[PDB]
Design a protein around this ligand. Structure first.
Ligand SMILES: C[C@]12CC[C@H](c3ccc(O)cc3)C[C@@H]1CC[C@@H]2O
Ligand SMILES: C[C@]12CC[C@H](c3ccc(O)cc3)C[C@@H]1CC[C@@H]2O
Lengths: 10, 235, 235, 13
């Protein structure tokens, strides 16, 4: 997953 | 959706409370400027701001109602626009100066340190001059930045909800201007003036994205992993 | 000192409608399929001929005649591709999934693959045209939007006179929506919806400008001296 | 000469 994806998922 | 149930005053309060903090640069005043060090300062700042922007976006009413894929796409398209409107807002009361950070205030002459950046500095400074000539208010600014987030990638089923929230923000803007004593004619006129700025904000972001892509290919500035992914999303 | 400010809303509409340029045709050769050189030739030949009629249209836009030659040049150099693209999108509105470059040049997204890197631009143009169709965009609203692009896109790269004319066009857009029976809330919501699309049109022009620049550098297509100069204004 | 756009605007009909 993209970095943005993980940060949005937190 | 719970965002659609908000009045205008609740929308402003929610947007104002979500506001990200103003970060400081790593600017070492003793260090003489090079093209690499100034681009290094700007991109390091942008990388740290992106973390706060992501968590700001989650607090923008309606944004979390979108699928995770849709949130990724919106921020990928609008991240530099959002950073730039923030810069322009910070710089409003600093004529001829861009306040990237409280300790990083640059004029167009210092932008010449980076090849091709002075043309972008001039466009940001002119946008800042336009905000100052309009006496843009903080409540109007937070609406505009949320509009960019929801609008910039909306055209690249449940988009009806995005447009529904976008209309709620239009409602909020008119509400603010009505509360400011503007006539009906003046409200629509100011609304139009504010939204046409976003066309210019798209332009500078397009130009700034190409410039950032040139510094990456030249191996001038070590770009962070997040910033590289946000940059590759425009190709 | 400008005659444009004394115009009523109906007079503004009539002036813009009478200013509309003609719909030009492409060459009639039925040889299919197109090559990349053939299609880019058709598209640039058409754009070149449309540019001559655009100059005539711009001189008929209320307030444009009152500007100096240099200011007129600046606005046109800045907005020329945006102006061709909103006209293209307008012409294609009744043709879902297709782009009516001309009455004898109606292309789909698969024909956009005939030119390298244009299918992305085709898709954006198609999404814009579908957005206009779903909004039931009226011809009176269209001429106001195209004139706004002309006056606004280059206004922050130079203004008081221009901003007063833009305000006049906003009053005209609102008046048209009131005349159609929209409530006050529906009026400003629709005004915002249309003006936000101009941010997308700017994006499509910037992408199209870089694509046209690559075609010249790659010597795919002979570009007219006029096109080369309009392209050179964007550096 | 200078700019084709100059002649087009000056000769606009
Ligand atoms: C985009 C850019 C790096 C990031 C800069 C920037 C950084 C932080 C910020 O809040 C706004 C803007 C603007 C520069 C202009 C040219 C350069 O490529
Ligand atoms: C800019 C471009 C050539 C002109 C095209 C065009 C668009 C509108 C129009 O009325 C005529 C021509 C749009 C193309 C998109 C890519 C290509 O380079």
């Amino acid at each position: 997953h993209k970095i943005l994806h993980r940060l949005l998922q937190d | 959706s719970l965002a659609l149930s908000l009045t205008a005053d609740q929308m402003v309060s929610a947007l104002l409370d979500a506001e990200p903090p103003i970060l400081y640069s790593e600017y070492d005043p003793t260090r003489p400027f090079s093209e690499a060090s100034m681009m290094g300062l700007l991109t390091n700042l942008a990388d740290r701001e992106l973390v706060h922007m992501i968590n700001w976006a989650k607090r923008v009413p309606g944004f979390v109602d979108l699928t995770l894929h849709d949130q990724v796409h919106l921020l990928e398209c609008a991240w530099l626009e959002i950073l730039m409107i923030g810069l322009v807002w910070r710089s409003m009361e600093h004529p001829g100066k861009l306040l990237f950070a409280p300790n990083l205030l640059l004029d167009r002459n210092q932008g010449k340190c980076v090849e091709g950046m002075v043309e972008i500095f001039d466009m940001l400074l002119a946008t800042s001059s336009r905000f100052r000539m309009m006496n843009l208010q903080g409540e109007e600014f937070v609406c505009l930045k949320s509009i960019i987030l929801l609008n910039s990638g909306v055209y690249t089923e449940e988009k009806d909800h995005i447009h529904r929230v976008l209309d709620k923000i239009t409602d909020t803007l008119i509400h603010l201007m009505a509360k400011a004593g503007l006539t009906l004619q003046q409200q629509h006129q100011r609304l139009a003036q504010l939204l046409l700025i976003l066309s210019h904000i798209r332009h500078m972001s397009n130009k700034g994205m190409e410039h950032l892509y040139s510094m990456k290919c030249k191996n001038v500035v070590p770009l962070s992993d997040l910033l590289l992914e946000m940059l590759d999303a425009h190709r």
